[PDB]
Motif scaffolding. Sequence first.
Motif: not given
Lengths: 119, 119, 120, 120
Positions: D1-23
């Motif tokens: 949905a464009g959301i799945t993948g790895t995301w970074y903030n400026q303070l140095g944290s990372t989050f890896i997420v999977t967006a499911g078809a069901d929300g």
Amino acid sequence: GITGTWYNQLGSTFIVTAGADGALTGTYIGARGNAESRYVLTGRYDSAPATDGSGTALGWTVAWKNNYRNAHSATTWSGQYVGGAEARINTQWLLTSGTTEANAWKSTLVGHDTFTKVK
Amino acid sequence: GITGTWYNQLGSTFIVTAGADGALTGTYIGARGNAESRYVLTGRYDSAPATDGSGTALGWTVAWKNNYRNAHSATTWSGQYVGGAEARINTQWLLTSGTTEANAWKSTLVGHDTFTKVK
Amino acid sequence: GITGTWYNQLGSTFIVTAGADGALTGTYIGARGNAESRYVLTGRYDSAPATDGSGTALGWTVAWKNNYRNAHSATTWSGQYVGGAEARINTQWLLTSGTTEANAWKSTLVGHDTFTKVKP
Amino acid sequence: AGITGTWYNQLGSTFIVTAGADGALTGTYIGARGNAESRYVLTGRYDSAPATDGSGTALGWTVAWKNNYRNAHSATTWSGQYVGGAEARINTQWLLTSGTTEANAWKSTLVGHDTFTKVK
């Protein structure tokens, strides 16, 4: 109906005068009731509210310094006055403390408070 | 320091004066920048901040009524001034609109604004 | 303790199960109470809280889309469960609506909810 | 949905997420340090059928700050929107609640904001 003395659930008191020009001025007193517990408050309110049962929007700031103490912080309350026999000011508040840049992410507490004309 | 002309990310102007007594007084001029868009601000600040590198805590309120329009709402900003070169005021804000009791639950918006002296 | 059916001051129902691994799962039911107002919720809670008389931190999210409707919004509640005589969960919440860029400054509402196991 | 993948903030944290078809949103939050002791489970929800008028996609998620190596007795919830494009971003507001005694509940909850992007 805003001018006067208001009390919250935790022991604080604030006395306020609502001026005709939209000004709120008064003093906020912490639970201790002490001269060392009195601080200045200033704000603004909607001087021409709707008369359709909607509340009256308002906000105020206290900086937590007086002649005796200084916590290097300020609180702002944003909310609305509701009149009637069960009159109340319902607010949400933000408390910001002076911090270094590295700690700025934890500078600001959020909460809510309701004030009434009797305790 | 605090006294002067500040601009937010969106095109608004905040003209403020910081008094020795801890008072903030001024005027807010919305993005358009005409007379009908000028509103009174009042607030408070820590007039004796820590000397260890921390910001100076402050807050202010604008009620969205002037001689030309009334939105029946008020915004409060809560944050801190960080000096040096590239002085900035970092804030979080609460905008409350007067509502009926039924709609009180959606009365308040929250956001963040950063102000600088450079437009 | 946290697992059960909870009610807020405005008529809504929160049915939740607190998993052994820190998972919160359940259903949120709006005040109307019919099937069109049931939504899925998911969250996390501190499964090993402090023993000094502190509350149990927790949070959860509901996106406001089911098969009947879609508000293009999501609410997150952050709070603590306090056990005792009249157990309660005290929370603050943020509701963000999808908006365009020009209107993102008014995307997010803030409020607070208190839930109890006894319905008002 | 464009959301799945790895995301970074400026303070140095990372989050890896999977967006499911069901929300469903499921993943891992990894603080700045980067090691196992700094990894935590995330769960949330998102609008799986956003408007097509250019509005953002509303979502939220929670992390409780407990893993097998440590417990800070607190949880954060992020409430925001995904905005797609070449410079995709997730703009959020967050609340961090700490478990406290009742006498200290008034200072239990911090509020802030953060923006996450796909490039570090």
